[PDB]
């Protein structure tokens, strides 16, 4: 029917600008509403202030309980049928130096840790969710002698490692150097014993792919993976040694607008999508002015979902039961309300 416009929630200033140019070129088929944080963003979605956004596994879980549903998945593979075939997602991994000692999954206690950010999927949710059953309480400041968890209390032992000066030290955002998959890996190399990151993090930051001096001489082969059974495997072996598998980023919207957003978005990708990509004098949807904006730049097409309609089926067994046993206890307000 006469599907009305779709509002996109732009988490940043740049997410906003991109969303604007989009809005224009879409001739209003899509419009934007800004937000301070990803959460309240998903809230504006909740009440009808906004019609959709895309988010990682954990947030998909949160909105999932909030009653929203994933319409489409982000696909980074090159395929002749990109949209048809669903992608298996990615792997969370605990990375260590091949030259580091005796570290094993069970003996991590007392060791120094490097995390992407608190509350985020692979750097926090998965690892802390798996260790939660071991320690079965909520204080992770107690488990590791110290580490870097961006977003943790400033006097927390988990800010002890984090770099950065003044107010932004340990900050959840790039103001803090050890923030992110990247920052987490850097932390591993310079400070921590363990790093919790995705399986692409190491190759990404080694072999000269990362210009910065600390990296770039770093040999991917010099780092390995901690397997849940006590053993280790090479970085390229993450499939057979890992904590849990997260799903691809996906777009979520309220039940009613589901069909509509689904419809319009596909048109949008055929207009602005992979090819044509001429981002020079035209608008490319997946390309970004800075980094992945409203979409991972690695995005090829937005794909349908065969058997997974529901956020639980989407996230898959491995994800949950590695999490939700974690929270349980989560200080996120929206989750609490949602319960």
């Amino acid at each position: 029917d006469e599907c009305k416009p779709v509002k996109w929630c732009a988490l940043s200033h740049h997410e906003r600008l991109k969303c604007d140019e989009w809005s224009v070129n879409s001739v209003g088929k899509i419009e934007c509403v800004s937000a301070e944080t990803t959460e309240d963003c998903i809230a504006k979605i909740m009440n009808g202030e906004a019609d959709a956004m895309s988010l990682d596994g954990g947030f998909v879980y949160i909105a999932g309980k909030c009653g929203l549903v994933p319409v489409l998945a982000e696909n980074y593979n090159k395929s002749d049928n990109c949209e048809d075939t669903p992608e298996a997602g990615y792997f969370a991994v605990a990375v260590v130096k091949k030259s580091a000692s005796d570290l094993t999954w069970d003996n991590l206690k007392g060791k120094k840790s490097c995390h992407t950010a608190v509350g985020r999927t692979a750097g926090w949710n998965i690892p802390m969710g798996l260790l939660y059953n071991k320690i079965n309480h909520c204080r992770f400041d107690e488990f590791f002698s110290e580490g870097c968890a961006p977003g943790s209390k400033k006097d927390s032992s988990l800010c002890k490692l984090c770099m950065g000066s003044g107010l932004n030290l340990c900050e959840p955002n790039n103001k803090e150097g050890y923030y992110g998959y990247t920052g987490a890996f850097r932390c591993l190399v310079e400070k921590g014993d363990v790093a919790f990151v995705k399986h692409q993090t190491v190759p990404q930051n080694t072999g000269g792919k990362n210009p910065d001096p600390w990296a770039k001489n770093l040999n991917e082969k010099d780092y390995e993976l901690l397997c849940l059974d006590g053993t280790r495997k090479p970085v390229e072996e993450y499939a057979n040694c890992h904590l849990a598998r997260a799903p691809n980023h996906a777009v979520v919207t309220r039940k009613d607008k589901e069909a509509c957003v689904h419809k319009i978005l596909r048109q949008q990708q055929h207009l602005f999508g992979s090819n044509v990509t001429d981002c020079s004098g035209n608008f490319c949807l997946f390309r970004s002015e800075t980094k992945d904006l409203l979409f991972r730049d690695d995005t090829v097409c937005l794909a349908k979902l065969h058997d997974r309609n529901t956020y639980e089926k989407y996230l898959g067994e491995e994800y949950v039961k590695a999490v939700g046993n974690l929270r349980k206890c989560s200080t996120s307000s929206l989750l609490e309300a949602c319960t």
Partner: protein, 853 residues
């Protein structure tokens, strides 16, 4: 020569004309008639004419009343990938099969039909009567020519005889060539192209041991001598240009062209010699095979890094059986494949165009004017046309340019893909033409009805890859404690390497409505028309003429396609010429023209969802041209001025409604009639007699008056005429020889740059919002060449002809030809950083020898 319809604004060519001119190629024919352009299809073939500021399906192409397949470009595939696509080409005609072609500038719809919007091109199948004669009871002809530019050679022969009433005519033509060489200086023997190559890893943890290479027992025995992991490092290599692989490609890609044409024309003369009953069978098949060289054959650590950053490291990367180190270098392909560094990739297009037309014709002729008709004819033709794209990609050779190579166990990291897209059309046509006269009246009636179809099939779409079976495993473990190999010299990994596993997926899908959907897109339908035109002569002083025609077409499809009976398009033309003389005289012409939505435009935009068929008006055009001419001993010197209006132009876009009071787009993307633009040109030409021995002068120029949009529409782009060929002068000077038999000629074509006012435009979005766009990244710039031709018909039967084109070398790049870049061309080139690849030919020699009996 002329002429069916007073006025002018058109040209004539005859078999003899063509031959004298030595035209072997579509580019040749119009090379001297400025303002007419060929429009490259990017894989090296034709794809129509550009005239009066338009091109493609905007200008008609007809043969013996049968229209020729339109330009159909299917929508772009997503993901990945690099897919075949639709040929988009328009059928090529065998000139050795034709008598005299007629070209016309401005809307011709009155005598052409649909598609005549910007102009028209009409052909004539050669007549058996070419056995002439008179006297001779039969004839035989042979043509052998050689073009240096395309290194092509063409051979045609036509044998014919007429016994009593019966008669027979057989023509066979064939050609092999390719690639149309450029000015030598276009590029020579260089550049670099870094390429990934194996080097020892240098990590201390990089050691490993492979199972099959330990004869005795286990890890602890064999470990003593570990191999070291290999890592990718590109090295700068230097090749050769023509061997290089784009971007930065200074060459036009290799092309293999081949063509075979057959013409059979029986006819029987009936009793009293008036009646003629005859039939025709034509088969012309041309093939264009090319390899896109724009596609880099090798990786390239940069590519590997890209993939590492996306998918991360791969199992076994750097590991190799025995000493074979390229074994360790492989990366993420497309369609879930790993491609080895040791092979190289190539992309090949095999494009094959087939035309097959058989029919019956009956002609009644009476003289002098007696019966209700001086000339009457019925024509029934069954024709068909097809274009077979057949894309292939392979990464299973040294490359080596190998198109046969494929994936297998022995070639662990190989890849292959095939995507074939076939677009075709068929006509079953009855048409009747009657001409009656009175003496100053000339009456003309033209009728027709046809059963037509356009069928697009998608088949032979699939992939293949072998992927090396590999495993990293851990040794027993007999001890009650287990070790995890870290790859250290003292503790290398325990690895199994094995044969490539071949797998082939089918890429064809059904009902998804995207490129990958292979359901036949078929369109069928009936169309008739009734055309009448008559001209009259008033004394010596003036001549006027006028015509009117009515067309009706209904099309059905089993899909939600945009098909509909398009409405009763009715067209007209009027013309006059005044003869106050003095050897002078004046002329005026007015005509209407139209085009129905291209079957591609009818199939719709298709975002992969359900789409509604939104009926669309035909593109409309109005042409007015006024001219003057000076007749006399010297010759006729003509000057013309024209205005063409274009309206209801079809583009992909959105509907626009107002309220609030702003604009709102609705509701779905498709092709609609969103826009109108106007052009005015000027065209001079004359041929002097000088009382050396003669010369000919032609000049043409075109300007863009205005462009405006339906204002109820949006997201429409703007027009962007890239199709108008920059104004040029053509001045020939030649000397024949009253009977002599020998002849000489010379020609000077000069073109001015290009604008750049015609390469601009706006996307025109909501409110005062729009984005500036352009058709192209650069302009062409001005150039001039001189061609020189000659011929001698020693012992006049055998006639030899020779020519040297671009006598001076004069390296230049024509814009034709660079139109292939962006501008939504039928097949778009990118990224084209160099542009040297678009250079026109240097000095080239064409040699022809004809003989007749």
């Amino acid at each position: 020569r002329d002429n069916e319809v007073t006025g002018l604004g058109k040209l004539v060519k005859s078999s003899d004309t063509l031959s004298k001119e030595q035209v072997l190629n579509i580019r040749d024919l119009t090379r001297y008639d400025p303002g007419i352009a060929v429009v490259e299809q990017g894989r090296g073939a034709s794809s129509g004419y550009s005239i009066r500021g338009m091109d493609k399906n905007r200008v008609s192409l007809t043969v013996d009343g049968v229209s020729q397949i339109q330009s159909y470009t299917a929508q772009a595939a997503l993901g990945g990938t690099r897919t075949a696509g639709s040929s988009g080409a328009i059928n090529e005609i065998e000139y050795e099969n034709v008598k005299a072609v007629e070209i016309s500038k401005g809307s011709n719809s009155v005598e052409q039909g649909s598609g005549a919007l910007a102009g028209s091109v009409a052909f004539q199948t050669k007549t058996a009567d070419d056995v002439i004669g008179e006297g001779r009871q039969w004839g035989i002809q042979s043509k052998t020519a050689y073009s240096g530019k395309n290194r092509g050679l063409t051979q045609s022969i036509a044998l014919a005889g007429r016994i009593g009433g019966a008669e027979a005519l057989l023509i066979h033509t064939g050609r092999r060539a390719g690639e149309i060489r450029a000015h030598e200086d276009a590029g020579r023997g260089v550049q670099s192209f870094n390429r990934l190559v194996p080097v020892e890893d240098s990590s201390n943890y990089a050691y490993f041991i492979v199972k099959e290479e330990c004869k005795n027992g286990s890890y602890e025995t064999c470990k003593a001598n570990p191999k070291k992991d290999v890592v990718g490092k590109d090295e700068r290599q230097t090749v050769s240009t023509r061997d290089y692989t784009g971007p930065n490609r200074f060459l036009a890609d290799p092309l293999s062209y081949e063509s075979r044409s057959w013409l059979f024309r029986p006819g029987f003369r009936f009793e009293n010699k008036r009646h003629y009953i005859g039939g025709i069978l034509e088969h012309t098949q041309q093939t264009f095979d090319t390899r896109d060289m724009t596609v880099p054959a090798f990786l390239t650590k940069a590519v590997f890094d890209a993939n590492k950053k996306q998918a991360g490291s791969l199992p076994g990367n750097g590991k190799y059986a025995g000493n074979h180190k390229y074994g360790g270098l492989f990366t993420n392909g497309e369609n879930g494949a790993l491609v080895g560094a040791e092979y190289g990739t190539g992309v090949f297009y095999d494009e094959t165009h087939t035309k097959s037309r058989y029919g019956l014709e009956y002609v009644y002729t009476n003289a002098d004017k007696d019966t209700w008709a001086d000339y009457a004819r019925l024509s029934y033709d069954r024709q068909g046309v097809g274009l077979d794209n057949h894309f292939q990609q392979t990464h299973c050779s040294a490359d080596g340019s190998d198109k046969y190579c494929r994936p297998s166990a022995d070639k662990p990291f190989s890849y292959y893909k095939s995507d074939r897209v076939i677009y075709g059309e068929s006509h079953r046509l009855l048409q009747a033409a009657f001409k009656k006269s009175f003496d100053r009246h000339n009456l003309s009636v033209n009728l027709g009805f046809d059963r037509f179809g356009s069928n697009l099939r998608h088949q032979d779409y699939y992939y293949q890859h072998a992927n090396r079976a590999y495993s990293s495993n851990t040794p027993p473990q007999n001890n009650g404690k287990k070790i995890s190999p870290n790859g250290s010299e003292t503790s290398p990994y325990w690895v199994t390497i094995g044969r490539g596993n071949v797998v082939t997926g089918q890429i064809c899908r059904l009902g998804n409505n995207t490129y990958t959907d292979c359901t036949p897109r078929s369109i069928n339908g009936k169309s008739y028309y009734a055309a009448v035109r008559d001209n009259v002569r008033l004394g010596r002083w003036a001549d006027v003429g006028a015509g009117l025609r009515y067309d009706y077409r209904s099309t059905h499809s089993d899909d939600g396609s945009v098909s509909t009976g398009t409405h009763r398009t009715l067209s007209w033309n009027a013309g006059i010429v005044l003869k106050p003389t003095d050897w002078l005289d004046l002329t005026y012409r007015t005509s209407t023209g139209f085009r129905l939505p291209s079957f591609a435009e009818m199939y719709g935009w298709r975002a992969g969802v359900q789409s509604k068929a939104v009926k669309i008006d035909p593109e409309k055009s109005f042409n007015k041209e006024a001219g003057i001419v000076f007749k006399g001993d010297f010759g006729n010197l003509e000057a013309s001025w024209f205005n063409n209006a274009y309206r209801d132009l079809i583009v992909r876009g959105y509907e626009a409604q107002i309220k609030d009071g702003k604009e709102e787009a609705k509701g779905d993307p498709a092709y609609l009639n969103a826009q109108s633009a106007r052009i005015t040109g000027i065209n001079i030409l004359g041929k002097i007699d000088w009382n050396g021995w003669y010369s000919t002068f032609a000049y043409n120029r075109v300007r863009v008056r205005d462009i405006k949009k339906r204002a109820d529409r949006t997201d429409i782009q703007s027009h962007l005429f890239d199709a108008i060929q920059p104004s040029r002068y053509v001045v020939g000077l030649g000397y024949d020889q009253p009977e002599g038999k020998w002849g000489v000629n010379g020609m000077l074509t000069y073109s001015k740059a290009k604008e750049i006012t015609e390469l601009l435009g706006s996307r025109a979005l909501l409110n005062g919002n729009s984005r500036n766009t352009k058709a192209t990244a650069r302009r062409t710039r001005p150039w001039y060449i001189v061609d020189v031709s000659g011929y001698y018909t020693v012992k006049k039967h055998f006639t030899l002809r020779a020519g040297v084109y671009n006598l001076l070398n004069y390296r230049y790049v024509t814009w034709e030809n660079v139109r292939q870049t962006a501008g939504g061309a039928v097949n778009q080139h990118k990224n084209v950083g160099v542009y040297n690849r678009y250079a026109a030919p240097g000095r080239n020699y064409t040699f022809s020898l004809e003989m007749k009996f």
